[PDB]
Amino acid sequence: NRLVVTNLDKLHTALSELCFSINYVPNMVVWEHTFTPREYLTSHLEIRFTKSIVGMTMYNQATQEIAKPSELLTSVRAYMTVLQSIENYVQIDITRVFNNVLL
Amino acid sequence: QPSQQKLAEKLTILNDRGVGMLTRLYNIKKACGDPKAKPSYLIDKNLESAVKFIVRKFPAVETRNNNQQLAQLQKEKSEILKNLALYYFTFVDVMEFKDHVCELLNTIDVCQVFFDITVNFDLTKNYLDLIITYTTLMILLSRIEERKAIIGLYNYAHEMTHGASDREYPRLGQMIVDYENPLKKMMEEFVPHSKSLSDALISLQMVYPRRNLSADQWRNAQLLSLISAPSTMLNPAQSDTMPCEYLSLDAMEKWIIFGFILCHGILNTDATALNLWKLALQSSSCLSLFRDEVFHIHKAAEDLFVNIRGYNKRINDIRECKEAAVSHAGSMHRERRKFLRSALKELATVLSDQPGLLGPKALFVFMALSFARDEIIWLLRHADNMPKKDDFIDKHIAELIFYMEELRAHVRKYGPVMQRYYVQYLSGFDAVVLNELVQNLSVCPEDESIIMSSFVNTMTSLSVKQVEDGEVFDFRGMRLDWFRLQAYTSVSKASLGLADHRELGKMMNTIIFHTKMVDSLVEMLVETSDLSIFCFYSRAFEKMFQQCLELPSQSRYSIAFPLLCTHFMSCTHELCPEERHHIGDRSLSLCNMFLDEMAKQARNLITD
Amino acid sequence: QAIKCVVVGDGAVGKTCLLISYTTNAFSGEYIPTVFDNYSANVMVDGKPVNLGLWDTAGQEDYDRLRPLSYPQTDVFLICFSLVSPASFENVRAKWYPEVRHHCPNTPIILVGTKLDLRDDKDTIEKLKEKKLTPITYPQGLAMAKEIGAVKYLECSALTQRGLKTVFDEAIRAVL
Amino acid sequence: REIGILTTNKNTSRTHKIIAPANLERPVRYIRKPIDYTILDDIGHGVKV
Amino acid sequence: LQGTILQYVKTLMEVMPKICRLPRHEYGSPGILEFFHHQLKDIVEYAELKTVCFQNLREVGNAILFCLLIEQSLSLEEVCDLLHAAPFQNILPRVHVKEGERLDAKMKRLESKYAPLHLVPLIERLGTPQQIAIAREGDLLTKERLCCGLSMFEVILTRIRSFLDDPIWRGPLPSNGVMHVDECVEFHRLWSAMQFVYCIPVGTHEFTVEQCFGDGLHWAGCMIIVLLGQQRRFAVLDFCYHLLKVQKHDGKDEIIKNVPLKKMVERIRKFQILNDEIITILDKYLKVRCFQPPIHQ
Ligand SMILES: Nc1nc2c(ncn2[C@@H]2O[C@H](COP(=O)(O)OP(=O)(O)NP(=O)(O)O)[C@@H](O)[C@H]2O)c(=O)[nH]1
Ligand SMILES: [Mg+2]
């Protein structure tokens, strides 16, 4: 039934609503300054994606422990799949984001 | 010399001057409110003795005997003159403005002008607006608690350096010592002006009571619904009192309360004014003098009227009105906002589906914008002030603002269709109707005739071919000429009385509105949905944004807040150029912060 | 300026047909029963512009509970009965008139006969005779209207639109 | 070529987060002037006195 | 669409009310449900709607979803492949630059370091002409791909719109000269009727639409509405949305024809959210008339 709400759908609904607001205006002018909101999201996504990748390696120098490459690759693929789903909402290009972060 | 009075030019110029003076006084009060931007000469302890001596006797000036209580101020007179010239001259300009208004009001009284909002909307609106601007300016001046120190200190330094006091100082000092409770003196000063002001206020009985209906009446009459009757949506919405449809209800309350306070003599005699006065009191508990400045109405009115001999009934009436307002005003406005949210949503969606309907139904868009703006302003000023207790917090204002922006965008994008629709209207219908009306007049002078003939000829020349070519029109001449015609015909001993030709005035008002829409779309949008007040209520502005982000449902309408920051530059006046950079910088910061927060929330959901 | 009118009566008495004939100037021969509907027309009567809001109730027994919603905050009451149906005529005496009296006791009532065009039809007088029924005549309505104490009594025919305008114009006059 | 038959271009472009004008809005100094009633005469059917 | 679905909509449109007017708020949420059940009682009693028409809509809706998902996966694999070809194409990242050195010098040094990896000039300086031509063609094919400013979902939507050509989808021209308000001669009207019937709470012994068809049915309906330019009208004119608005305004609960009123409105709200999300996605992937004024007699 649809009356039961999980965490995934709740986050999905909130994200879709926020993305629609961001994409409502392509550009705006304030005191002769042009603002592009989607660039704010794009930059934040790049930083967060890079931070998460460096974080899920789970490297502790004290115990000499690191994540296995296969698990990291699976997590990266899941992250990329989610980001592509975001592209279904907003007009931003994601392939470039992958190129910069991964390179 | 009734024709040479030039009331139209005087009214429109003084109104702008009063707004500029109000901005200057507000800046002065704000600067001197905090002990960081006020003049360094008032915070120094060594100079405290001189300030106290001058405060003890502000208008009286004595310099030839220092008495050992002022030697400190002797050595820094030159810097005083160089640094306090701005404030002294600003007050001087206020005195000049005060003198000019008094002369104009006296000229109106002797001329025995005819005032009626429905007949001559422009003249009555300008007259009332000017009076409120004058009253607000004096009230704001009576608040700055240092006006005496600046004037006394500056002149004393001027006397020491030059040996003679300022020429215009004594008049300013006399008024300052006369205006300690400005409303008390204004009531006595406005007695000769009671007749004209009272008539104008009573003329609002045909507009104000029907514009203050609860949401239930709006739902009963299906206000602002294009879909309710489908067979007549193509028909153009119109009314005889077209200008009054989108008038600011807050302005009406300010006009009513201030006008009857000054014209309290007529309250006992007339009952229509008393009932209108009662309704205004019930509608609101605090009123907005300029930007954040606010005036409570029940305590001030009670204090003024307690001294009166037999006004006990008025004192009581204020009490019940206060009780009713504090008990029901919040609920009434909450219901109004609830209805408006759906109405704007329906109107915006329909217009988007059929953009061509904007022309015929442009009045509905402006009416909706005005109502939404009034509710936002009312909530914003009451929420911060009036702690009674929750009930003055709304979590759905984002939708109202977003749909206001959507309507503004639609008008901007679909301007040409509105221009084409109304240029055809003026050339085909209004021109013929006006011509047959003028030709059916008993007699007219040359001054009045040269204006009517010019209006008909300008309307006939207009063609649709000039719209698609990008031509830009200029109908300011017609509006000013009509305003002059109203003044000429509204006075007594006039050949062509406007009172006997009321239908003519209504027809011209509708035509003026058509010209305003055709040529002044931007001016209409700003004056209908002005929301620059948010720049001076940042705390509430940020809190509402935070609440909107927290609630997922309203997150769709979080882009309204950055859009509102674009309006922050509409409150600037050419007279006060210093304020422009600070307000302009504040707009850039808030916009960046909102976008950053929205991105932060988005990436947080991405991680989860 | 705005007058609220609600029309009540037995089923198949031509109520919605009368309102449709007044607003769109068209006739429909089909029978589609109505739980509730709203029809609006703008009219110039007695030199005062009046905007008329018209409310349509149901004549079916099952919708009785959903009918009282229309009654509150009203100005005039319209009762319509078919001239070729004695059953509807007697219902005014024992059902439709007593009901408007309970909910709104001080509101005027205008009684309107319907299907005048079918009244003179021998073809219609004949089948009703096989049922042992006879059509209503003009004086009978006068007595009933005087008895129910209505402001006025009239007759109408949507097909011929002979008395359609008078019913609404007279209804505006009763409220004034 | 086969997948290309059903393919269309993307209207995607890059712009900086904040863009400023070539010339900024410099402040304008304030000059005190008296009230003048002979400024609206040149527009419309004005009267010269 | 041109076959079984077209026949079903044609039959269904004939059992829909000719004129439907959204009740006024005075009637209240309980009374407004009774009006809709009587007005649309033919659709509710219809049995094949939940067996055939829903099935067919699910087929098309699932197909569109498959087209969307496969395109996303193709781009994801394509970008991953291109990432591995950067060293051989002189595609270098943004190296860190600190105080003391400029970007140009660091980039030039980094490019020189990876010069041997670059393939084309190495073959050009020495190598058979056939090798040069093959390497050039291979490099051109690898660098140019379908994630560098190319998509195909738009083309699919356009083709689907072309398939819809029967006048029944749009209906006859409006009498008012602007838009249909009360008439029910448009598809969005029927979709609203469909929304009403499957938003009714089902019994314990029967399954729900989500349990059977999922989101495919909703995707198909929204796509059809969007391609016909009726999304705004659907939002404005909707029996379920109107009932939800009135219920919120008054807040009353009562069993009407064994159909609880509360649980119905939350279901309406949930489907309203899903429809809005689908419409927004379709509109994003998809990226006048002037009236004349009155003339004096
Ligand atoms: N010949 C003729 N038929 C009429 C006339 N008025 C109504 N009818 C027919 O009588 C039938 C009933 O009319 P209708 O308006 O539907 O009745 P109602 O009382 O408004 N219906 P409801 O029971 O839902 O309230 C219809 O078939 C209609 O065509 C009339 O003046 N002449
Ligand atoms: Mg009916």
Q: What is the largest CA-CA distance in chain A?
A: 55
CA distances from C16 to B59, B566, C57, E78 (A): 82, 53, 9, 66
Asked if B346 lies within 8 A of E236 by C-beta distance, the reply is: yes
Q: How far apart are the first and last CA of chain E?
A: 50
Alpha carbon distance B339, B219 (integer Å): 8
Task: Indicate which technique resolved this structure.
Answer: cryo-EM
Task: Give residue C33 CA to ligand 2 midpoint distance, Å.
Answer: 6
**E287 Cα to chain D: minimum distance (Å):** 9
Instruction: Please state at what angle helix B446-461 crosses helix B476-490, rounded to 10 degrees.
Output: 150
The nearest alpha carbon in chain E to A9 belongs to E274
Name the token pair of E169.
């989808």
The ligand minimizing its distance to the Cα of C96 is 1
Which residues of C participate in the annotated binding site for GTP? 11-17, 30-31, 33-34, 58-59, 115, 117-118, 157-159
Alpha carbon distance B55, B32 (integer Å): 17
The ligand minimizing its distance to the Cα of C37 is 2
Alpha carbon distance B572, D28 (integer Å): 13
**C106 Cα to chain E: minimum distance (Å):** 22
Alpha carbon distance B270, B152 (integer Å): 46
* B370 Cβ contact list (under 8 Å, min separation 6): B246, B247, B248, B249, B528, B529
DSSP structure string for chain A: --S---HHHHHHHHHHHHHHHHHH-S-EEETTEEE-HHHHHHHHHHHHHHHHHHHHT--BTTTTB---HHHHHHHHHHHHHHHHHHHTTS---SHHHHHHHH-
Contacts of D10 in chain E (CB under 8 A): 149-151
Contact B399, B552 (CB under 8 A): no
Contact E236, B350 (CB under 8 A): yes
Alpha carbon distance B390, B388 (integer Å): 10
A20–chain E Cβ distance below 8 A for any pair: yes
Class of residue E112 by CB neighbours under 10 A (exposed 0-12, middle 13-18, buried 19+): exposed
Pocket of ligand 1 (CB under 6 A): C 11-17, 28-29, 31, 33-34, 58-60, 114-115, 117-118, 157-159
Contacts of D20 in chain A (CB under 8 A): 32-33
Task: Give residue C29 CA to ligand 1 midpoint distance, Å.
Answer: 7
Q: Is C52 helix (H, G, I), strand (E, B) or coil?
A: strand
Alpha carbon distance A56, A53 (integer Å): 5
Long-range contacts at A7-10 (CB < 8 A, ≥ 24 apart): A7/B608, A10/B552
Pocket test for ligand 1, best of C8, C13, C17 (most atoms within 8 A of CB): C17
**D21 Cα to chain A: minimum distance (Å):** 7
Q: Pick from A34, A40, A43, A46: which is nearest to A18 by CA?
A: A40
Q: Whose CA is nearest to atom 14 of ligand 1?
A: C14
Name the token pair of B455.
């209006």
Alpha carbon distance D37, B138 (integer Å): 23
In this structure, which amino acid lies at residue A35? F
- Tally DSSP H helices, then E strands, for chain E: 14, 1
Contacts of A78 in chain E (CB under 8 A): none
Contact B344, B408 (CB under 8 A): no
Using the atom order of ligand 1, give the atom closest to the CA of residue C158: 31
Q: Where do we find the tokens 């009434």? A: B332
Q: Whose CA is nearest to atom 24 of ligand 1?
A: C33
H or E, element range at B378 = helix B362-384
Beta-bridge mates of residue A30 = A33
Q: Pick from B266, B407, B293, B256: which is nearest to B346 by CA?
A: B407
E28–chain C Cβ distance below 8 A for any pair: yes
The nearest alpha carbon in chain E to A91 belongs to E284
Q: How many CB atoms lie within 10 A of CB E43?
A: 17
Alpha carbon distance C18, C21 (integer Å): 5
H or E, element range at B480 = helix B476-490
Using the atom order of ligand 1, give the atom closest to the CA of residue C33: 24
Alpha carbon distance B535, B582 (integer Å): 11
Task: Give residue C114 CA to ligand 1 midpoint distance, Å.
Answer: 9
Q: Whose CA is nearest to atom 26 of ligand 1?
A: C31
Choose the closest CB to D43 out of B86, B451, B476.
B476
Contact B244, B156 (CB under 8 A): no
Asked if E21 lies within 8 A of C38 by C-beta distance, the reply is: yes
In the structure, do chain A and chain B come into contact, i.e. share 3 or more CB pairs under 8 Å? yes
Alpha carbon distance B144, B234 (integer Å): 55
Q: Which of residues 15-44 of A touch D (CB under 8 A)?
A: 27, 31-36, 39-40, 43
Alpha carbon distance B194, B262 (integer Å): 8
φ, ψ of residue B537 in degrees (nearest 5): -135, 50
Using the atom order of ligand 1, give the atom closest to the CA of residue C60: 23
When scoring B548, B555, B570 by the number of chain A Cβ atoms within 10 A, the one with the most, hence best to mutate, is B555
In the structure, do chain C and chain D come into contact, i.e. share 3 or more CB pairs under 8 Å? no
Asked if C36 lies within 8 A of E21 by C-beta distance, the reply is: no
Angle among Cα B591, B597, B603 to the nearest 5 degrees reads: 135
Q: How many CB atoms lie within 10 A of CB B184?
A: 13
Name the token pair of B393.
């917090």
Alpha carbon distance B274, B254 (integer Å): 15
- Number of domains, chain C: 1
The nearest alpha carbon in chain A to B566 belongs to A30
Q: How many CB atoms lie within 10 A of CB B52?
A: 11
Residue E172's Cβ-side half-sphere holds a number of Cα atoms within 13 Å equal to: 4
In the structure, do chain D and chain B come into contact, i.e. share 3 or more CB pairs under 8 Å? yes
Q: Is B272 helix (H, G, I), strand (E, B) or coil?
A: helix
**B588 Cα to chain A: minimum distance (Å):** 7
Q: Based on C-alpha coordinates, what's the Rg of chain D?
A: 29
Contact B402, B557 (CB under 8 A): yes
Tell me the count of C-E CB pairs closer than 8 A: 18
Alpha carbon distance B558, B397 (integer Å): 10
Chain A: residues touching B (Cβ < 8 Å) = 7, 10-11, 13-15, 17-22, 24-25, 28-31, 33, 35, 37, 40-41, 43-45, 48, 52, 82-83, 86
Choose the closest CB to C69 out of E21, E26, E38.
E26
Q: Which residue range forms the structural domain that includes residue C122? A: 1-176
Class of residue E247 by CB neighbours under 10 A (exposed 0-12, middle 13-18, buried 19+): buried
CA distances from E75 to A49, C151, E71, E148, E150 (A): 19, 80, 6, 9, 10
